[PDB]
Ligand SMILES: COc1ccccc1CC(=O)N1C[C@@H](C(N)=O)CC(F)(F)C1
């Protein structure tokens with residue numbers, strides 16, 4: 027579990043979105059596994075606007091943060107799950123690191139702020155849904 031709170035927005039993995047998220051929907055994209063909903067309280071996360079390929083992520087299955095080198099956002103094949111059939115997920119960045127399904131929502135941060143959230147994993151790899159291109163999160 028986990029979300030990003032920036033201004034009047036809440037960013038979560040689309041497959042983990044709640045009834046409230048869907049009732050206050052701003053935007054959603056199945057191909058990215060992202061959903062943004064509105065909030066009544068004000069958020070203070072800083073979204074990074076950069077091309078960093080190093081950062082730190084939170085891994086709930088280990089109660090620890092880990093430093094990682096990660097790839098540039100791209101289309102990556104993802105196996106079928108209970109939420110999606112087998113497909114290419116876009117705007118995904120991979121890194122070598124531990125992750126389990128419950129780790130989704132954990133934040134990846136670089137020196138500039140929030141980069142994205144855990145969205146996929148398996149076999150010693152962890153994938154993050156990028157949020158740095160969503161310029162509207164700020165205005
Ligand atoms: C962090 O996730 C994992 C880590 C280790 C092993 C397995 C996973 C799970 C995983 O990759 N998915 C894909 C994900 C998606 N974005 O399509 C949806 C899902 F969470 F239900 C299953």
Ligand SMILES: [Zn+2]
Nearest residue numbers: 076078136138
């Ligand atoms: Zn950065």
